Amino acid sequence: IRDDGYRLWGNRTLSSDSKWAFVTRVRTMDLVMDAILAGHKWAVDRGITKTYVKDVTEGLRAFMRDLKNQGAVINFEVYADPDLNSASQLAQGKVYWNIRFTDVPPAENPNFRVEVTDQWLTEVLD
Amino acid sequence: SFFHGVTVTNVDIGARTIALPASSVIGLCDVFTPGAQASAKPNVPVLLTSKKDAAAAFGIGSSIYLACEAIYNRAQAVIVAVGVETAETPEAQASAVIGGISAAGERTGLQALLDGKSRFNAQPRLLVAPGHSAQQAVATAMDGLAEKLRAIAILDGPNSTDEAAVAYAKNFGSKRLFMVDPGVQVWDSATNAARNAPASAYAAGLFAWTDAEYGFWSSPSNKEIKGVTGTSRPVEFLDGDETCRANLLNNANIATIIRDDGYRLWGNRTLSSDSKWAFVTRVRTMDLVMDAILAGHKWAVDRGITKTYVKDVTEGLRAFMRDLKNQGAVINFEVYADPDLNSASQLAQGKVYWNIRFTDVPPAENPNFRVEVTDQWLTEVLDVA
Amino acid sequence: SFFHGVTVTNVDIGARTIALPASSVIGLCDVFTPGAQASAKPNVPVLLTSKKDAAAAFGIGSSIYLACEAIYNRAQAVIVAVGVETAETPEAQASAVIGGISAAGERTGLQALLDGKSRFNAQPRLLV
Amino acid sequence: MIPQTLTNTNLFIDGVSFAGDVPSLTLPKLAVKTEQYRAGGMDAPVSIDMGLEAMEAKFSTNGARREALNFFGLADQSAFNGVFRGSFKGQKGASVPVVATLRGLLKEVDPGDWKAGEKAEFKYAVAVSYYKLEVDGREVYEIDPVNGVRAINGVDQLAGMRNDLGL
Amino acid sequence: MIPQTLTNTNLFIDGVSFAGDVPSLTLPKLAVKTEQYRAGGMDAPVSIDMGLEAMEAKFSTNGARREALNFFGLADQSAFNGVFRGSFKGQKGASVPVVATLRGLLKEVDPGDWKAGEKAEFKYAVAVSYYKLEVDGREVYEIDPVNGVRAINGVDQLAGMRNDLGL
Amino acid sequence: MIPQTLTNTNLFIDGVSFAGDVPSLTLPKLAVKTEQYRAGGMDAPVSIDMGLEAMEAKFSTNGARREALNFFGLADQSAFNGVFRGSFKGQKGASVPVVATLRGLLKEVDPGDWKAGEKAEFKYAVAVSYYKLEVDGREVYEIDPVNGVRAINGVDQLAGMRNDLGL
Amino acid sequence: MIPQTLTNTNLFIDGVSFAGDVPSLTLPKLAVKTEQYRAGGMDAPVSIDMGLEAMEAKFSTNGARREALNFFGLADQSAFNGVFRGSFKGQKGASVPVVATLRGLLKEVDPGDWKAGEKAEFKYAVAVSYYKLEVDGREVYEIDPVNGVRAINGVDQLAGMRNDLGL
Amino acid sequence: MIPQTLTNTNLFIDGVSFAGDVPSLTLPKLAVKTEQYRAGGMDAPVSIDMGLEAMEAKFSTNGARREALNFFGLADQSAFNGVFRGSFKGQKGASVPVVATLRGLLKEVDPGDWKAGEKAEFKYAVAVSYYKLEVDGREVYEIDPVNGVRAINGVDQLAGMRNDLGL
Questions:
Q1: Which residue from B232, B234, G16, G40 lies 20 to 30 Å from G96 (Cα-Cα)?
Q2: Contact, B126 vs B216, CB < 8 A?
Q3: How many domains, chain E?
Q4: Which residue from G91, G94, G95 is facing D78, i.e. has the nearest CB?
């Protein structure tokens, strides 16, 4: 923008899908998708058979409380989705859990609704 | 080679006419002839610091430098000046001044004054095209240029009779213009002939001077013009005169000069149709507090909106606005976030709305001295007692 | 689309009259004319918290908005209000304020404020 | 009334949360510069208000909070901005917030003795100019020294003696 | 933020490590010489910065550290050089270093009472001239009294009032 | 009566408010030129008025308020204009304005010694001609030396002795 | 206005900076020679200007700054050159330079009593002729006694009364 | 370095060992008479060495050590001679001796309160003139007030300012 090459100006990324429009959302999504990878690599080399999904999910929320601590997110919640049909169906395969987080929205377009009034002209002059 | 020692040099200098420094950047656009002396490309703007860079970038007899020396006599200001090429017909000389995106990629004419920012860190808060503002085509485009920069575009009426410029200042309800009708005659270094300068650069040089120590909120009317003799048309001001040339031009929203040899300006009101935007302080403070609100909150125009982001800057927009009330720029204000226009869905896309409600100091146009010679103090006085 | 970077606007704010966020619940029934701007059916209740809902659910040319401004100038409360459609006969204007259970599963006028329960766990404590 | 005490505390400086290292705050002691006054026709002096005095608002942190060390002794006095948040939970549940916006000069960075096995406790102090305390969002104190603003509970207590000095 | 405290400490004097006997340090209390200022048209004074005051940086050792006793009262004032190192480990592992280069006069050697069964604690004090604190290698304070250097976070806060005195 | 003392002060020069830097005003000491008079047939002299003597009205600032320094020693004597406002707040609320219009010659600009770390205290002094004091708007003093006006509480105390001097 | 006070000071003599040893400057007290004037038809004298009186501009050092001691009592009176620089920093950042060019006679070198353990405090005094004061570069005072120049804020206040003395 | 503390202590007076009753000593607090110095062209004063101050070396015994009571207030000041021995054993075995030869006036015999069931603790004090501390037989301090001997680590720190006073 300014005098020299001072500042950048883009807040968006090149996504048509307006959910992942901000660059700060895609870089936190692609950071927490890496904690799932290291949370799976750590939950595969130590024989975590019967307690896998409890070892991954709580180990994932050890990373989500870090992001709430650093200010990177505002909400964090790892949800047990109601698309689990039957107990024999779900425990044999396809346990569907969710991850929701409200990223910190960057202040794009602050707005100043500015006046010139006659209200305090009477109080000052008299 | 070089010279060792000390060197006295018999030179030709004169008239140290220094001015106190200013900060309000003005834009400038007039004709000049790019020979071998003027080292400036004829369509891009150059930044001017003083008379040295005004004479290095443009010719000595050029109409740029005759207008650049009109402001540096009055205020050591920052000029963003884009010269234009001299043409022959007034139609084609006007269209060189407005110009536009008429190149393949770049800008020319008046439209290169948006490029003062991003080359010079100098957003033009004043606009003046000296001499090329009596035509309708430029002055229509100077106001559309001044609305984008949020500035004050200075014009001039024609140098015809008095009723002509009244008829010329009816084409604008533009609330950011400013018209100075009588053409200043200047001496110019042992000429014994008065050059009819357009008096748009002198009045635009008065605003940068009064921006410095009287403040932007100060009415730039009563204050002195320097480097000026008896103007083109004598505009008197007679009190109680229904048809005097000042009041005939004040009611037509035109600034004039009044006192001897054009001592001082006389316009307090802008070229507007609204009565809320009448004065040249209600529109000047409206813009020049809101660059000072911004310069001071340039950090707030991108930052993660946390729980406290709405509150810590609305206690910072107040905390700058008290400094304007401290130095007399405003009266009591109120700055606060909208309760009714701040939802979570607006915050999720970054948008957030604040209100700023100040009131400006009214300038003292028309003091009134109603006076009777009584026969009151005569009885007890003038007696032997 | 959207807009990036700060924006200053020439606008009109009419002299802020903010008050205290009160806790009691107010019922209200007055008359207005429905339009495309007033985004509320007449005989259905809606809770209101600020003047943005008295200008969007109900028109500013109304008489609810004369009385929602009356509460919001004084104390920021939670008003559950319904609308009575505009009549001309001085009994038929008041007989639509009363109403009954003429609808299938809906009370129309003043009786629609009985739907404050089982809907928000906030009955009206005042009836206006 | 309900029994209501302080439970938790927070500190912001230019938006930056100190959610991890603030062991102590201190709001500025608001005190009137009392000049005791016994004159002819009375005894037991009557203590006319002359105005306040200086308002140092100490606090301390025990980490390398460089974002708090950068505001010491700048060229712009009253450029340290910050709030002293704090919630009073009471006994009946819902907590009453107390925030305190400050604007002053960080006039003291006092690093503690480093006894190598204890805490650090970088004790600070800000001689504030502007001061605004809130309780449950409701205003109680506007203390602005320059341009004469002492607004106790929203009503200006110096406005009668500001339109006579002509400020 | 993370909970971050002082854990361990170190002291160097002219390169010589005091890795074995320093029970305590004290960084110099940086304080502005605040002159409270109430004038016509205000109340509740506003505390203009006048400058700092003297910066004594006490510490103590309890052995015969003759390499620290040799620097008392020399002819060259500001010849005691030394750093006050110290690491803040935080909670998430990696420690944030804080070092503090000093240059002053060792103006006090205070040998403690020798109670024959307790420690020694040779308490010292250096009225430092030069002072440079770092956090994680990043600069926060350059305090040089003579030749007018007060550089808070790298930007010189007296440079505007050094090219007018003509220094 | 209620106890009533000075709390805040102000100064204008040519309409320009000194809301920031006036630490000390001083109203001019009004004093009758007393000649102790003992004559034949009495003792214990009785002090007949002879008129006033000159009225220095000192004040001070401690910045280089150039709006005040330009009034020193002009060719136009009695061109320094200025009002010495002040508000006496009392105990029962209402503040009584005391203003004092001047018109005199700024005869002495006295910068103090600059000890490099204190206030500057530019002590000034105007040897006033015109002097009009108000209390809550109601008139108490007019002292116009030239053309002879001494109006105490609105009645001219020289009017009986100016219609016989032929003035 | 903003509160504005003196913080730092400097002195040059013949271009040589006294960046180390000037504890106290003193600008010369500008003072109109007042004669209180009461005549026929008035009272309360009105103090017509008569011109200035002499301007001692004291200062001090506390070392034997031989670059300053050689200017005492030369055959060339008005050969002591010197500027009394000073910076008034204000509250909102920017520091306003106040300089004061001198040209006078160093008339009094006063060493204090040497109590062997305190400062020396060589108090000096120049009885200046030329005196030019600046505030932020903008001109306020020129006092040239010989050949008659008194320019207050750039306009010569003797120019109306020097073209009739024939000077 | 090794962890090194004080373990045991001894006191001699004119050769007489106090091997049985000394519960406490106190070496004299060597401190420079620091005069803080801020002048024109700087801030944050720089603390020039002016010299030391008086050196009282307290100690105490709790028996009838008449061989220590005989030296109070004699005609010959600086006739109390004595060493303050003390060994620092460290951690690696061999102990580093610290001795401190004194020569001064026993200016205080302070017998404690005799509570009849507690100790006695005759607290003393010697305003020493001569002072010589050693560490492992190596010299660190020669402090002789008269005839100008301040020899830090064997090299005389006042010899440059003794061959100019002509001592």
A1: G16
A2: no
A3: 1
A4: G91
